[PDB]
């Protein structure tokens, strides 16, 4: 719900997402605590379109 | 939705063919949020520094200058041309950069960071270690320099203590507020004879010129008085890169 | 500075823009020079503090009382308005005394009665709220017959 | 040796609750702690409010009467008759009798309805009296006359 | 500024004063340079830093191994702790650290 | 009478009383309970009650069903 | 007139009936006569205006505080 929505930390503020309706909503993240190969999953995908 | 970090968002259109994820690419970024800003419009801003914690290394490459920039409805613009001067020739000394404020920064349509605010950006692409750590950061700053009307002779000889200077000699209604953070710097007092015998008794065994361990020593003694002790070290060499000294 | 006896007869001409942020009354005194519009004075209230008081304003042409610190015609400051014949006051005293309260521009009361003891608020549209011994409870009256 | 006090003052370093208009609409009382009590000359609103979201206002705007919780209860009097809302409960007790009346039809909803008397139990239709249910529907009794 | 004001310029030659000598004669400071003076003020200062394995080096990021943030960068953890009382310098970090 | 964070209360020693001239509508997102010594429904015009999962009606007495012509099912 | 320095106290006698319809009451002055009946006067208030204002009047027998205008007695 964009007029009573929920924060992705309860700890911290984040913008709300502007949506003209209730919409339900997936997140994809990268994964902070891998490293393959001493690099970070960041290396891999700051590049692609 | 791309998802920016400090909780920021922006919406993507896929006819485009966009980025996957936001795109960083530089070693060191700082964001600066303002607030009761009027384009378009002048800003001091005082950068106060401790200048000892500083790499030694190397010194700042061509090639590594600072950038500036302002934001503009989540896109970046550079300030490059509009800088008037930097007495703080890239944050490595105390003093005030004099920047030129243009009248399409805009805050309408922000959704990376903070709406209420105006946004301004310092970066470093690389080797971020060779740039000071910062005391403070304000605006609506200025520069002022004592005049003497017949004081004491030993007032220039130690630095005046924050928070003294707070009155103005002809008071207004408009200035609500003076402040003084921190101390002074740069004086120095007028010679008393037994430093000029000193002087001029070195001066007349080393004629000026440095050809001896003597003379270096003498020569710098004189001239900056900041320094507490120095050695001279003969057929010497110092390699920068390695940090090793060649006897 | 020549200084001024007693206390002095005062009217109001603006009562915004302060050029200081002072909250400060422009007032005239019609026995120096009424034609000019006077000058910036305080107020002394009930009740004043940090962001805390309580809020009451004249409006243009209203008749106010002033006093000046050290005598000095420069300082004015005005101690309070006053009523007269031709400015009614809201109720006629009796010699019983029995009704009190806050009258306003627009008619609307707040008011307490000592002879039945009545708390009663006001609103000239018909809408009341009334505490009442003589009734031994509380009624809430609506203008549209809502009770 | 005589001092008398004759009262207080605002300033810059104190400011004062409301910022001055040329129209000067709002008058009142205000406190330390923010409570409120308060007129309003152009709507003819009086109000009293504490900082946390409780609210009593009388208003001709709104032709009537409103109660405001900081939980979300709500009782309001106005032009369409009395409403009550309540997020978690409502509840009504008596020694004597309770009566419901309307010259309209009463209608009576919720997840489950239960009716119970410690006495005699009786319904009436004077043009008919319908028992209904999509599931299994029970007459029960010690003793059951149908007619 | 006071709160009625929107700009104010200062001249040069302006004097401020500075208190009194060791000797009791008043000091006085001037105005280097022309001024002017509005309601603009800092509100908020965050910083990012982009770790790499050409640090070492001294060269651009190549080969990323992490994006590290601070919200609050005046402070001493980066998300607003507060400096020991005591402390007579108290600096930070302009984009943080690893 | 009082409003607080548990809802609305209201009680008396003496009598509760409502009248309208329009409709009363009385409604719960939950069960609705109503006790008394005696329970009087009565309508001017048609009467009825309606479980959706099952209507019961019982008494611990004789119980009566009346009408001028009575139809089960 | 001879004039009076100061401030004074008063006694309040009487709150009705002025001859002339300005809101004043009658009081008196202990110092100068505390026999007589005294003379009317004004009241400042908090706030006043046509049909307006705040009315508290006090009871016969009240301490209250004296001005006058120009040192008029």
């Not at chain 2, 004086?187 to 037994?194: I, L, T, Y």
């Not at chain 4, 008398?4 to 400011?15: F, I, Y």
């Not at chain 5, 990323?64 to 007579?88: R, W």
Request: negative net charge.
């Amino acid at each position: 719900r964009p007029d009573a929505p929920i924060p992705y930390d309860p700890k911290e503020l984040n913008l709300p997402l502007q949506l003209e309706r209730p919409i339900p909503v997936a997140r994809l993240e990268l994964n902070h605590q891998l490293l393959v190969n001493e690099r970070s999953p960041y290396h891999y995908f700051r590049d692609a379109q | 939705f791309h998802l920016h970090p400090f909780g920021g968002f922006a919406k993507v259109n896929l006819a485009v063919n966009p980025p996957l994820l936001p795109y960083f690419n530089q070693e060191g970024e700082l964001f600066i949020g303002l607030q009761n800003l009027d384009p378009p419009t002048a800003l001091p801003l005082l950068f106060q520094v401790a200048e000892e914690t500083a790499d030694i290394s190397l010194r700042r490459q061509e090639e590594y200058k600072l950038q500036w920039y302002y934001l503009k409805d989540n896109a970046w613009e550079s300030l490059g041309d509009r800088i008037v001067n930097d007495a703080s020739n890239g944050l490595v000394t105390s003093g005030i950069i004099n920047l030129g404020i243009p009248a399409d920064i805009s805050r309408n349509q922000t959704t990376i960071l903070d709406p209420n605010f105006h946004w301004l950006k310092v970066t470093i692409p690389a080797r971020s270690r060779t740039v000071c750590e910062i005391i403070g950061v304000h605006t609506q700053a200025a520069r002022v320099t004592f005049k003497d009307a017949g004081n004491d002779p030993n007032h220039l000889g130690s630095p005046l203590a924050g928070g003294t200077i707070s009155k103005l000699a002809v008071p207004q209604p408009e200035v609500k507020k003076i402040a003084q953070p921190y101390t002074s710097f740069g004086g120095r007092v007028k010679e008393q004879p037994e430093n000029f015998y000193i002087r001029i008794s070195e001066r007349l065994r080393h004629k000026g010129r440095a050809v001896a361990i003597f003379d270096y020593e003498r020569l710098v003694l004189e001239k900056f008085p900041q320094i507490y002790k120095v050695r001279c070290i003969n057929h010497g060499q110092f390699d920068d890169a390695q940090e090793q000294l060649y006897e | 500075l020549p200084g001024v006896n007693g206390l002095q007869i005062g009217v109001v001409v603006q009562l915004q823009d302060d050029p200081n942020g002072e909250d400060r009354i422009l007032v005239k005194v019609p026995i120096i020079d009424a034609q000019a519009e006077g000058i910036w004075a305080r107020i002394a209230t009930l009740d004043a503090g940090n962001n805390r008081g309580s809020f009451f304003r004249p409006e243009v042409g209203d008749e106010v009382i002033l006093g000046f610190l050290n005598d000095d015609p420069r300082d004015p400051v005005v101690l309070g308005m006053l009523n007269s014949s031709a400015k009614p006051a809201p109720l006629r005293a009796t010699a019983e005394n029995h009704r009190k309260g806050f009258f306003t521009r627009s008619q609307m009361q707040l008011t307490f009665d000592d002879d039945k003891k009545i708390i009663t608020l006001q609103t000239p549209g018909g809408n009341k709220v009334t505490i009442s011994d003589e009734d031994k409870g509380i009624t809430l009256t609506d203008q549209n017959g809502n009770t | 040796r005589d001092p008398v006090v004759l009262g207080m003052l605002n300033s810059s370093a104190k400011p004062a609750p409301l910022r001055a208009t040329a129209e000067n609409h709002r008058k009142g009382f205000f406190t330390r702690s923010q409570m409120q009590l308060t007129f309003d000359d152009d709507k003819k609103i009086i109000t009293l409010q504490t900082p946390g979201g409780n609210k009593v206002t009388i208003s001709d705007e709104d032709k009537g009467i409103t109660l405001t919780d900081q939980n979300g209860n709500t009782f309001a009097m106005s032009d369409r008759g009395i409403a009550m809302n309540s997020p978690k409960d409502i509840t009504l007790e008596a020694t004597g009798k309770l009566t419901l009346k309307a010259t309209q039809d009463v209608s009576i909803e919720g997840l489950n309805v239960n009716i119970a008397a410690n006495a005699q139990f009786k319904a009436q239709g004077n043009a008919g009296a319908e028992v209904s249910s999509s599931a299994i529907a029970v007459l029960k009794g010690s003793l059951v006359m149908i007619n | 500024l006071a709160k009625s004001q929107r700009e104010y310029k200062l001249t040069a030659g302006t004097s401020f004063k500075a208190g009194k000598d060791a000797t009791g004669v008043d000091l006085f400071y001037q105005l280097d340079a022309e001024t002017v003076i509005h309601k603009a003020q800092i509100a908020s200062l965050k910083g990012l830093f982009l770790d790499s394995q050409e640090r070492k080096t001294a060269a651009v990021p190549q080969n990323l191994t992490g994006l590290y943030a601070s919200p609050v960068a005046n402070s001493v953890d980066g998300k607003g702790g507060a400096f020991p009382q005591e402390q007579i310098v108290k600096t930070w970090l302009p984009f943080g650290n690893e």
